Amino acid sequence: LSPADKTNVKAAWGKVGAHAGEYGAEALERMFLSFPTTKTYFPHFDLSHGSAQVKGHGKKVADALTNAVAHVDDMPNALSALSDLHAHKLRVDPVNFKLLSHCLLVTLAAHLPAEFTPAVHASLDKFLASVSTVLTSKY
Amino acid sequence: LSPADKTNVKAAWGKVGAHAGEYGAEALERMFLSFPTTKTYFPHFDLSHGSAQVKGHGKKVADALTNAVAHVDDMPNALSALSDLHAHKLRVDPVNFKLLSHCLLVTLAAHLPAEFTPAVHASLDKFLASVSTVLTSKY
Amino acid sequence: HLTPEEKSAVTALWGKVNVDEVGGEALGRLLVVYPWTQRFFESFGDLSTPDAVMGNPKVKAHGKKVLGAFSDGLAHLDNLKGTFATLSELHCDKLHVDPENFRLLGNVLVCVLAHHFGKEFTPPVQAAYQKVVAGVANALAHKYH
Amino acid sequence: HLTPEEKSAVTALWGKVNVDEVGGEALGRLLVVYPWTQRFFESFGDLSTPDAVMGNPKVKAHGKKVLGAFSDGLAHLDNLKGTFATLSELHCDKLHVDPENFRLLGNVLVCVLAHHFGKEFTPPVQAAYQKVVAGVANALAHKYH
Ligand code: HEM
Ligand code: HEM
Ligand code: HEM
Ligand code: HEM
The CATH code for residues C1-145 is: 1.10.490.10
Contact between residue C66 and residue C91 where contact means Cβ atoms under 8 Å apart: no
Q: At residue D97, what is the residue type?
A: V
Q: Packing angle between helix A118-135 and helix A94-111, nearest 10 degrees?
A: 150
In chain A, which residues are last before a break of more than 2.5 Å from C to the next N?
A: none
Contact between residue C81 and residue C75 where contact means Cβ atoms under 8 Å apart: no
Tell me how far CA of residue D92 lies from CA of B73, D86, D102, D145, in angstroms. 40, 10, 11, 11
User: Which residue from C54, A76, C130 is spatially nearest to B106, judged by alpha carbons?
Assistant: C130
Please tell me the distance from the alpha carbon of residue D115 to that of residue D132, in angstroms, as a whole number: 18
Contact between residue C114 and residue C126 where contact means Cβ atoms under 8 Å apart: yes
**Which residues does D80 contact at the CB level (< 8 Å), separation at least 6?**
D73, D135, D136, D138, D139
**Tally of CB atoms within 10 A around C61:** 13
SS (H, E, C) B38-97: HHHHCCCCCCCCCCHHHHHHHHHHHHHHHHHHHCHHHHHHHCHHHHHHHHHHHCCCCHHH
User: Which residue from C138, A34, B58, C111 is spatially nearest to D128, judged by alpha carbons?
Assistant: A34
Which of A57, A101, A130 for a ligand 1 pocket mutation test, highest count of atoms within 8 Å of Cβ? A57
Angle subtended at Cα B136 by Cα D131 and Cα A108, rounded to the nearest 5 degrees: 45
Going from N- to C-terminal start, the domains of chain B cover 1-139
- Residue C99 beta carbon below 6 angstroms from any ligand 3 atom: no
Alpha helices in D76-122 (DSSP H): 80-83, 85-89, 99-117
Closest in A110, A116, A121 to D121, CB measured: A110
End-to-end, the C-alpha distance of chain D in Å comes to 20
Please tell me the distance from the alpha carbon of residue A78 to that of residue A83, in angstroms, as a whole number: 10
The answer to whether C36 contacts A40, with C-beta atoms less than 8 Å apart, is no
DSSP for A46-60, please give it: --STT-HHHHHHHHH
Q: What counts of helices (H) and strands (E) characterise chain A?
A: 7, 0
Tell me how far CA of residue B130 lies from CA of B16, B76, B123, in angstroms. 19, 9, 11
Tell me how far CA of residue B19 lies from CA of B23, C116, D19, in angstroms. 6, 20, 57
SS3 label, residue D79: coil
Chain center to CA of C118: 19
Contact between residue D113 and residue D17 where contact means Cβ atoms under 8 Å apart: yes
Going from N- to C-terminal start, the domains of chain C cover 1-145
Burial profile D1-13: b = 16 or more Cβ within 10 angstroms, e = fewer: ebeeebeebbeeb
Burial profile B19-30: b = 16 or more Cβ within 10 angstroms, e = fewer: ebbbbbbbbbbb
Q: At residue A135, what is the residue type?
A: L
Please tell me the distance from the alpha carbon of residue A52 to that of residue A46, in angstroms, as a whole number: 8
Best C36, C101, C105 member to test A by mutation, with max A CBs in 10 Å, is C36
Please tell me the distance from the alpha carbon of residue B61 to that of residue B59, in angstroms, as a whole number: 5
Task: Strands of D10-136 (E only): list them.
Answer: none
User: Which residue from D38, D115, D145 is spatially nearest to C102, judged by alpha carbons?
Assistant: D145
DSSP for C67-111, please give it: HHHHHHHHH-TT-HHHHTHHHHHIIIIII---THHHHHHHHHHHH
Angle subtended at Cα A127 by Cα A122 and Cα A129, rounded to the nearest 5 degrees: 95
DSSP code, position C118: G
Please tell me the distance from the alpha carbon of residue C120 to that of residue A120, in angstroms, as a whole number: 53
Contact between residue B139 and residue B94 where contact means Cβ atoms under 8 Å apart: yes
Please tell me the distance from the alpha carbon of residue B68 to that of residue B128, in angstroms, as a whole number: 10
Residues 115..144 of C with a Cβ closer than 8 Å to D: which? 138
For residue D28, the distance in angstroms to the closest alpha carbon of chain B comes to: 16
Q: What is the dihedral of CA A26, A32, A38, A40, to 10 degrees?
A: 120
Please tell me the distance from the alpha carbon of residue C80 to that of residue C93, in angstroms, as a whole number: 19
The reply, when asked if residue C81 is annotated as ligand binding, is yes
Please tell me the distance from the alpha carbon of residue A109 to that of residue C41, in angstroms, as a whole number: 38
The answer to whether D35 contacts B92, with C-beta atoms less than 8 Å apart, is no
Q: What counts of helices (H) and strands (E) characterise chain D?
A: 8, 0
Contact between residue C77 and residue C132 where contact means Cβ atoms under 8 Å apart: yes
Please tell me the distance from the alpha carbon of residue A123 to that of residue A6, in angstroms, as a whole number: 7
Please tell me the distance from the alpha carbon of residue D99 to that of residue D144, in angstroms, as a whole number: 8
**Tally of CB atoms within 10 A around D55:** 12
| Technique of determination | cryo-EM
Please tell me the distance from the alpha carbon of residue A101 to that of residue D110, in angstroms, as a whole number: 13
Q: Packing angle between helix A94-111 and helix A3-16, nearest 10 degrees?
A: 60
- Residue C101 beta carbon below 6 angstroms from any ligand 3 atom: yes
The reply, when asked if residue C96 is annotated as ligand binding, is no
DSSP for D8-40, please give it: HHHHHHHHT--TTTHHHHHHHHHHHHSGGGGGG
The reply, when asked if residue C116 is annotated as ligand binding, is no
Please tell me the distance from the alpha carbon of residue D1 to that of residue D77, in angstroms, as a whole number: 9
Please tell me the distance from the alpha carbon of residue C3 to that of residue B99, in angstroms, as a whole number: 22
**Which residues does D87 contact at the CB level (< 8 Å), separation at least 6?**
D69, D140
DSSP code, position A115: T
**Tally of CB atoms within 10 A around D139:** 21
Please tell me the distance from the alpha carbon of residue C102 to that of residue C110, in angstroms, as a whole number: 12
SS3 of chain B: helix, strand, coil, percent, to 5: 75, 0, 25
Å from CA of C3 to ligand 1 middle: 47
Please tell me the distance from the alpha carbon of residue B4 to that of residue B87, in angstroms, as a whole number: 31
End-to-end, the C-alpha distance of chain A in Å comes to 22
Chain B neighbors of C114, CB-CB under 8 A: 106-107, 109-110
Contact between residue D54 and residue D103 where contact means Cβ atoms under 8 Å apart: no
Select B1-139's CATH number: 3.30.1490.480, 3.40.50.12780, 1.10.490.10, 1.10.10.10: 1.10.490.10
Query: Which numbered atom of ligand 1 lies nearest the CA of A63?
Result: 10
Please tell me the distance from the alpha carbon of residue A59 to that of residue A25, in angstroms, as a whole number: 7
**Which residues does D36 contact at the CB level (< 8 Å), separation at least 6?**
B87, B91, B92, B93, B94, B139
D81, containing H or E segment = helix D80-83
Contact between residue C58 and residue C45 where contact means Cβ atoms under 8 Å apart: yes
SS3 label, residue A92: coil
